[PDB]
Design a binder for these strands. Structure first.
Ligand SMILES: [Zn+2]
Length: 627
RNA sequence: GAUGCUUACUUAGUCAUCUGGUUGGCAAACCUCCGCGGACCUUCGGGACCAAUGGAGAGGAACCCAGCCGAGAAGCAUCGAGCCGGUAUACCGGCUCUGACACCAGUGA
């Protein structure tokens, strides 16, 4: 499909004042960078704002601007492979011609199709909203170098925030349509039309689901429970009766459609972009760490010279090995961390497919939760048919568990489990493999130690803010405490990621089988609820999946993240699926367990390692216990 | 290795009983109300977001900035542990000499 996994691997080094310029002139130079970072993050946010009205509406006939929308985001598909200048330069010309920032009208190039050339004329012949009129008036004075990097980020912003999140939703909606029907005929008990009637009943009392389930599955006894714990919802049930035979089934109908991807513009507050300085717009010295960042208005080769953190000696891509293509300036808090964009190539894997193909299967081809079993069959079959030799005897495979106490990675080659030797994922003065009152390091109790301070310190902010203008926590409320937790929580995902990758480089593994856990929460997580800010201290098991998959493709490997099973209540020798939920929990505390009748006496990590490798093959099937 | 000095430096990669502790704030930065105007989603109740070569106000709890102390970064100096060479057992010269880790910033709870 698309080449999502790029071979860039950008390294970010924080900025310092030069060793002998000043401590105050550095503030007056970063302010010159923040002012230019404010404009770039706002120019991008305006270009993506003007062009978004040309998007397909998913249910309307193809507008003439649709075939230009697909070229703005992905110019590579709509250009010949022998493009003269760049796939990023034709994107600018189409965006230039769509606006009034080019009076030359040089769009008539052989590489531009007539379907596209005649479509931009249908885009320029459109009234602007009096903000794009001044926007492209500002962008008209910009040099072509700025506009090239300006349309690129804006196009890559919608393509990454809306288009991929929307394309993953259309198929999620098309399969929801089939799933909706396949639920109606298969469950025709008391919802031929009553489900619509229940929607009207739910409309009169805006509830917009544990409480709803209790109200629906109630025989007038739940009224006492509702009073103890709601009161308004009881009226709807009484009105419906004037009931329980269809209430328990109408709730599972999920009348609400899957939510559309809410588009957000690049925000300087919470989630921003990084400003790119293209070719001839920066100078980097790596012997002595100084960076020549150049602003937009600098005439002929003057640069603001800063100092950055020294390039690590243990860093694997050395600056002399690969050339730096661009510098990505972003502002975390107030300190301007810049990032270096270089080219580090990938290695050919032992597969004729790509990781992006595996992305396509789960994201859009098999998006639904009940459609997970078919995803594994297609994902497994795709890898085997693209495998050069017999994949049933020489497909090296790893399956990690990624726990907090410990994690073990089983080694599979031909469905024959070799050895689940563990991972040393704990961060103390030395890399241990297990935890020897709060545990010092990357333990759950240490992360929650900031949260209890974060909760205590947030009780003095709302109290003081109430006396100022009133008489919960903004993105800036805990600028230093939260970012440190961010650099700490993601580091636990960075350590786990490389430990997997370093483990997968010792033995020539071709496939990593991760699970689909959401993550683990520190002890101080269930008390700071109702706040988006608490999301920073969530261990984010998906973040490890982010980094493991990104690195595995770099080293020439594929990652398959199976849907979340129990994976630890599943035995490894037999398919028992222990449902005790008490002996397993008690045994998991001490790190071991035992199968009820199978007799396997492995640990929770090795068994999880063995199961996940077995789940990839046809030996173990998913629970699928919805009915 | 231990010790000392200096630095328009760092203390917002993390861990190592660790966003170090503490004192305040002209400028400024940060911040609270409005939005010239746009714009995503929507149960049409709103949610969420960008935003003027633009309007005021205000808190140092928070953010921001600055000072001090502790701490480590480097540049240099002294001695010790270990390696080698020649000259006449010593000396000079050179080297390993200073923690670990990490660095790409589908659905749903
Ligand atoms: Zn068993």
């Amino acid at each position: 499909p698309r080449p999502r996994y790029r071979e860039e691997r950008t390294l970010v080094r924080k900025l310092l004042p030069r060793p002998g310029q000043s401590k105050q002139e550095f503030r007056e130079n970063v302010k010159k960078l923040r002012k230019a970072f404010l404009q770039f993050n706002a120019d991008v946010s305006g270009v993506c704002q003007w062009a978004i009205q040309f998007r397909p509406r998913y249910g309307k006939p193809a507008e003439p601007t649709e075939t230009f929308w697909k070229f703005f985001l992905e110019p590579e598909t709509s250009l010949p492979p022998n493009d003269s200048r760049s796939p990023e330069f034709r994107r600018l010309q189409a965006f230039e011609a769509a606006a009034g920032i080019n009076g030359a009208a040089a769009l008539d190039d052989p590489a531009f199709t007539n379907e596209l050339r005649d479509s931009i004329l249908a885009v320029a012949s459109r009234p602007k909203t009096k903000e794009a009129q001044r926007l492209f008036s500002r962008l008209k004075d910009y040099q072509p170098a700025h506009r090239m990097i300006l349309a690129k980020v804006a196009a890559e912003w919608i393509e990454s925030r809306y288009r991929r999140a929307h394309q993953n939703w259309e198929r999620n909606y098309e399969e929801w349509k089939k799933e909706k029907q396949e639920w109606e005929q298969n469950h025709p008990e008391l919802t031929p039309e009553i489900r619509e009637a229940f929607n009207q009943i739910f409309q009169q009392l805006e509830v917009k689901p544990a409480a709803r389930l209790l109200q629906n599955k109630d025989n007038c006894q739940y009224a006492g429970k509702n009073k103890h714990s709601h009161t308004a919802l009881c009226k709807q049930y009484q009105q419906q009766l004037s009931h329980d035979e269809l209430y328990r089934k109408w709730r599972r109908e999920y009348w609400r459609e899957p939510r559309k991807p809410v588009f957000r513009y690049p925000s300087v507050k919470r989630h921003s972009i990084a400003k790119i300085f293209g070719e001839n717009y920066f100078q980097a010295d790596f012997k002595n760490s100084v960076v020549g960042l150049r602003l937009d208005s600098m005439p002929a080769g003057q640069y603001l010279e800063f100092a950055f953190a020294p390039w690590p000696r243990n860093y694997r891509p050395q600056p002399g090995e690969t050339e730096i293509s661009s510098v990505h300036l972003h502002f975390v808090g107030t300190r301007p961390r810049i990032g270096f964009r270089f080219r580090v190539p990938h290695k050919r894997s032992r597969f004729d497919c790509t990781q992006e193909e595996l992305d396509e299967l789960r994201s859009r081809t098999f998006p639904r939760k009940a459609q997970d079993q078919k995803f594994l069959e297609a994902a497994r079959k795709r890898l085997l048919e693209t495998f050069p030799g017999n994949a049933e005897q020489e497909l090296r495979l790893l399956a990690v568990d990624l726990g907090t106490d410990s994690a073990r990675a089983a080694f599979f080659i031909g469905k024959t489990f070799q050895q689940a030797f563990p991972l040393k994922i704990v961060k103390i003065e030395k890399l241990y493999e297990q935890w020897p009152q709060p545990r010092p390091g990357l333990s759950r109790d240490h992360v929650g130690r900031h949260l209890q301070k974060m909760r205590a310190q947030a009780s003095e902010i709302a109290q003081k803010r109430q006396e100022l203008t009133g008489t919960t926590l903004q993105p800036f409320d805990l600028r230093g405490l939260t970012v440190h937790t961010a650099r700490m929580i993601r580091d636990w995902a960075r350590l786990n990621a490389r430990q997997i990758i370093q483990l997968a480089e010792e033995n020539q593994v071709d496939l990593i089988v991760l699970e689909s856990l959401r993550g683990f929460r520190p002890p101080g997580y269930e008390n700071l609820d109702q706040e988006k800010k608490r999301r920073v201290a969530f261990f984010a098991h998906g973040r490890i999946r982010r980094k493991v998959t990104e690195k595995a493709v770099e080293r020439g490997m594929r990652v398959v993240t199976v849907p979340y099973l129990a994976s630890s209540k599943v035995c490894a020798e037999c398919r028992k699926k222990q449902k005790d939920n008490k002996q397993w929990e008690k045994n998991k505390k001490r790190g071991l367990f035992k199968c009820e009748g199978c007799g396997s006496q492995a640990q929770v990590d090795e068994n999880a390692a063995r199961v996940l490798g077995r789940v990839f093959w046809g030996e173990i099937e998913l629970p699928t216990a919805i009915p």
